[PDB]
Amino acid sequence: AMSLENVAFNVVNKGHFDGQQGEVPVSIINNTVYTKVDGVDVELFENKTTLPVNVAFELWAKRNIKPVPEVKILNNLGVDIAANTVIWDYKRDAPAHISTIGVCSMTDIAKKPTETICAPLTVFFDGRVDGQVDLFRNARNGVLITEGSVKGLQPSVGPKQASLNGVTLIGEAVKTQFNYYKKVDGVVQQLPETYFTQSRNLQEFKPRSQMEIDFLELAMDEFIERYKLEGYAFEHIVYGDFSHSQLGGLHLLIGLAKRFKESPFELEDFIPMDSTVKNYFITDAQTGSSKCVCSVIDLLLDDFVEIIKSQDLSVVSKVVKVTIDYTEISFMLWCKDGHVETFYPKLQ
Amino acid sequence: AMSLENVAFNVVNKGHFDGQQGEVPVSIINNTVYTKVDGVDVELFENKTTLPVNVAFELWAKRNIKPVPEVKILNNLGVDIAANTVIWDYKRDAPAHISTIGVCSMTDIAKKPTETICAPLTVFFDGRVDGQVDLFRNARNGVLITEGSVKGLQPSVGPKQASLNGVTLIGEAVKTQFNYYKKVDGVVQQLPETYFTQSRNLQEFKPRSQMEIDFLELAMDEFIERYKLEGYAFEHIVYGDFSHSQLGGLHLLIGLAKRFKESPFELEDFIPMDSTVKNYFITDAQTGSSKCVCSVIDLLLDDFVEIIKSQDLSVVSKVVKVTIDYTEISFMLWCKDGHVETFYPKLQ
Amino acid sequence: AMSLENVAFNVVNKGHFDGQQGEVPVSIINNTVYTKVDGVDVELFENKTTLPVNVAFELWAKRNIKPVPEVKILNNLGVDIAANTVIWDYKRDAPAHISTIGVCSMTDIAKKPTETICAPLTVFFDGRVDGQVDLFRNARNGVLITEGSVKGLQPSVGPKQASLNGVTLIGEAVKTQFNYYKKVDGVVQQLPETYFTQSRNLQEFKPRSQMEIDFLELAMDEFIERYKLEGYAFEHIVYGDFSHSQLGGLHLLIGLAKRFKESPFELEDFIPMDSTVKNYFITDAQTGSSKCVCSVIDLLLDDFVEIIKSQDLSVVSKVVKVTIDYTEISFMLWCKDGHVETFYPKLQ
Amino acid sequence: AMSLENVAFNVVNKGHFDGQQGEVPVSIINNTVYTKVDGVDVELFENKTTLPVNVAFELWAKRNIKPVPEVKILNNLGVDIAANTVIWDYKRDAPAHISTIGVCSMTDIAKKPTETICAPLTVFFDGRVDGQVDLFRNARNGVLITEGSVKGLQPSVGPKQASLNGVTLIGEAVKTQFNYYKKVDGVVQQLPETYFTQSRNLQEFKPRSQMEIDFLELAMDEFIERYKLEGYAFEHIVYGDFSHSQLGGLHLLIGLAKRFKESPFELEDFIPMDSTVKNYFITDAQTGSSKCVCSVIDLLLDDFVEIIKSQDLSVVSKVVKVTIDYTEISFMLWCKDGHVETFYPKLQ
Amino acid sequence: AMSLENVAFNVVNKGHFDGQQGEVPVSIINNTVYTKVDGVDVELFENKTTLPVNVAFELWAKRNIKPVPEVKILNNLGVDIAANTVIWDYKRDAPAHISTIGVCSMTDIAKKPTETICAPLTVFFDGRVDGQVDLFRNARNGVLITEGSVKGLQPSVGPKQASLNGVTLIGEAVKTQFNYYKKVDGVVQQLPETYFTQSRNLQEFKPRSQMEIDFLELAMDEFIERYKLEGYAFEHIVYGDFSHSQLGGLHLLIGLAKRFKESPFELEDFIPMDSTVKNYFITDAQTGSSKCVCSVIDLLLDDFVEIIKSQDLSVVSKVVKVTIDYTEISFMLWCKDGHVETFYPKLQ
């Protein structure tokens, strides 16, 4: 019994779509959905998507309000569509997937993920919803998240953090660490051994280890001394070189956060989406040092130290492939006389 | 002698409409009003209303720039239209009322509030403007604000704060506390005895009493001890319970402000408008505790303590009606064995 | 070989237009440019200009990413168009000039600034680009910036600061202080002796002299005592009078910054553009003191003290013309009994 | 080497996309594509589709300019996508199919119809294009059109008419009658015995038989006499009853054309699309007789006479299923005392 | 005293801008200008231009309502701007020129054509307006139209027809044949000897000579016999060959008009603008013969016969340049054994 007025009634009264009966008067003007509240129009939704306004409004209302995997993890695992839910991409203000299964009549390709249209697509299943572990078992392609063990299925322990309504958090009152499962062409796939990005912000960065606490507190030359990092180009890679017109290094989010406390800088997110490695056009406000494409990754400093120290430093240049967030991230390792010159998430 | 170019000349030269003669070249592109300043277009206004762009621009230029009652107070008092002014709703970026009286030819229903079209509408009158106290006396319906006494009219002392250009403040250089008067069907109405919401922000919250100072400084168990609040469920109602998947209580703005200093949280204002009780889809970033509809009221902690302590705690559940901002706010009081379990502004 | 898809490929892969070959799939919906990234549309640009979306996108991609003069300086020097570059106006989110020379086929009036269409326009030339000092010599009208000396040309030392990608900064890793040259009707013009505005922000204001350090630290009556400013109305002009309904003085940005640390205020930028003197509709949140048109200039306090102390204080009212950012700024000097009453950048 | 500017160059110089090299300056304003021609913008395309303006422009430029099957035939045969062409729907001013194969990077699901994504879709193959008869032979699902015979495959002779650039015509200088072949799950189908709609216009109707010539040239009572149609309700079904408030019958396009020659009428095409049976809200201007849903079919009068005369007239009401344009069209047959009362394409 | 409301008052009351005082309430919604007429909005103008809606509305209201030269003639003569008028391009629904002189504050480059900005532009002068013949005399670049003679200046007799409000006509109650004068760099030009296009419509074509009357009234083989046109390929060029998939010839509008009377056809005007030679994607509805780019010129049949008979027919292929509407039109002449094969306005 789906309608624009019922979706709007649910938003107004329940904070989101909750399947409740009722209608509120709605008006659509260009890309905005309004509702009449005591004679005046009140904005309920501004369409920032490439879908029609009323369609995007319904998908946003019907978004998953439980902690769900971050869009970067879902993309890295090849997810095409979700089963009977909408994963809302808060970084793009749009649905994470083009089509739906049993959500909205305009975007639905099927009502149930058992329909043959879904067979070639990697469907996302949520083990916390009844019957979805079985739907994954019957799916030709898919990604499954669970809170516990599935008999017979070998699990992948995912990241500690999940996205609850656009807030990336490591749950205390809710479970955010899931078991991951993937199927390609009817066959369960062994998910690789992987590092996870920490999903932290530059402005509200918090250290998640004693090495990270020591990086933000200690001076450059004494941190490198304490952690035996001499010859690993941390001065360039992690700390950043702001002495020339082109900003040198600065590829770890912790280094950007340390720099940010002393002096601010402009990070231009020219491709605004969730991804394991982010690209920014950075301009340091203090020195005027800048870089058009500065690739930044948020790894735990210990994980980055482990990656760089596990590399052979005897060649001039080579690609170093590291599994991060289930995807293979190519890095460019540049050495000279047995020491690192640079190490950066390779620009493609 | 009203024109788009004259309204724009006034905005450019006077900061708002000031009745000054002159014209500036204007260009309208979609919902934005631009003006040519030395060969380049400069944005003067972006239409966020459901009115035509040039009409919304004129009403915004013709907005009341004196401290006026907050839109929630005007709505609670049943105001439909203002007399010869525009009350700009800064929370909605739109006029507070659909039609005008003697303001804009496109939105005007009348030139003077004495026209019979205005008789059934509650017209807002400003006693600070010449002849408006008399216009209220002649109005069939209306709300009047004054700075002093009106002979014969029994006043209602309003809130200490008013809105000056979207800034809610308690005036020191201007008067913000008004006398309130209301008329329904030619008859002056006795405005009820009322509490007032404090209109504070979460991010720049300031305590307005020694009890409020003690709430933000003292620990939970010693504040409740000092103010004899044992058995009144302040731990749930005011402090908030962040231990379960559903966020418990957290219905007073002071409690949200105390929580905000320690850890941040997302408050989704899904119905963005001015109102006595606000509804937020809250997500606690620390714990992942969340609630789709968390009703929040900004009462002075002393006023809330007075309301909860003036209740009979012998029944399981009952509606407790409290007059706040001239409106009757229904609360849901839940008790057990003579103690409060919960008390919240009842969701309708 | 210019295309929308190639401009988008360059934005996606290089952070801006870099002349690289390649195409990415693009979709245009209303005023937004999107690109397909793994099956979902990602926003690359939102058109805030009065130009067509694809045209504004190309000019933004083709923007000058080197430290360039601030748009206010270029406007004050009468610049109409830039030679083979786009000066992006980050204060207006639009190109600083209507037409281009050798940049975009839609906005180009010429391919080279030597074309007779450019002769009557003041073309901006960048001495850091090969052949542009010669193009200035051949131009009938123009403004030239250089890093060093041009044989025979008498230079004007410009401001210490320039705009690098919208960040106004005094360069340490890049050069931001240029030599300025201007030509009117084939004849090189002597640029006047000038003060420069400091281009600081209210929220991140930093003192650039011991007088500025003393202004923000010392109390009003002891700063005026230390710097012998008795009788110069600094209490009104610089500190601001918040005792009446109309906010008195407050015309220097340092005074606004000092006030801002104690109590916040709303500054309404009703003409949002870069300019030597800015106009704000200010509302003091603490007192409710307000002014529709409060002209603010960011001069170094020492430069403002020098200007006010170099004035004859024997007449009631007179216009005081001061050269700031190469433009003549008219001030209104009001005196009484040999003392300053007020001194403000005269509202036109 | 696809670009918006190259698609526009092709439109401007070749009348459509012809793979020619070159670029013209383009500007996009809302849903319109313009090109600069001697300093002024000239409209090239107005987007009437739900696709982005630049995407719809490219698909329209890349439309099939050879006589192709009418969209109703393709829909009736279950065609989902075309192989390496765009079937433009001139009745909807939009592409006939959502996705493309080897046409536009934004809408392409595959480059070649041999990709596994196309296997479950009924792909349209044109035997006039080299290798497409062989692509149909290897495809799991698909519809093939040919001018001549295919080895082994028995054809289904299609309609005499095809659509050449939106003009439905029976070709004299081009071939418009095709052989149809269909494959479902790898098996060549035996297409059903079918009547074809004649695809004529009301305003330029031409008779295609001596019975049709006699219907237009003769009076009602003598045509029915000559063709022994007494008792078949042609007076109601074909001629129309304009004597009551509800317009009676009028379900054959020839009858509407006969009526149109005498007096005009408004046909409201409330679902504007190509389809075997059309629905119109008709209002007769002469009498004021009207019908909200008047289903109209354009059958050759001889074919309609054959259908109605091949029915059992002994029951009050029954569904009569007829294969028209390869689809099953349900009709409603209403009889009384062995005579037809009405016979109309069933409103479902 | 220019305003949007005054321009709208003039449109509503005078049918166009007539300088009358007064204002009507206006509302702008996207690209449409509305006015309130008795409580309901009535559409006054729909913007089909690339200019802002209110700017295009004012230029349309301020359009020249006297018979003016057709936009193709003005373009061919190199006119850039008009002096104190707006030449409205009814074929593009937009102003014929980008900028104005003394018309609209948004589009004006100057108030009087004597300003130095106008010196390098070819300004259009109308001798019917007081002092414009003298303004042409003093202007460096410009085109002058006059009804009668100018002292000293030898005229160029223009076409018999002019455009009166979008209606191309040969005036009987008004003068439509003008004397043309042109000046380049201060020197009066000798305008070339030229043929004129007749500017006729396909649907309402009228013969303007006994040869044209005979072309329409006679059969192909007897017209060619009467006018000794054997060997000049009129059967192909003028009559059209509809026997093959590609429509042969059909380059004269009289031939299209003759064909149109027998059977209809679709002419797709893919570059909709006024021009001496027009290009159409033609589809013949009777035969299905079609051509993507069919160049059509409307010459008087006698003028076309004179052009083709004044050509040397001894080479296989050559460009034949003919002055039509003051511009040089290249034709492609194809011969074989001394006879014409084809002759068409060269597709460049």
Ligand SMILES: CCc1csc(-c2cnc[nH]2)n1
């Ligand atoms: C609808 C009027 C009409 C069109 S064609 C036609 C006719 C031609 N030959 C016999 N009849 N009558």
Ligand SMILES: CCc1csc(-c2cnc[nH]2)n1
């Ligand atoms: C195209 C049909 C037509 C129009 S005018 C015309 C004619 C008039 N006098 C001779 N012939 N024939």
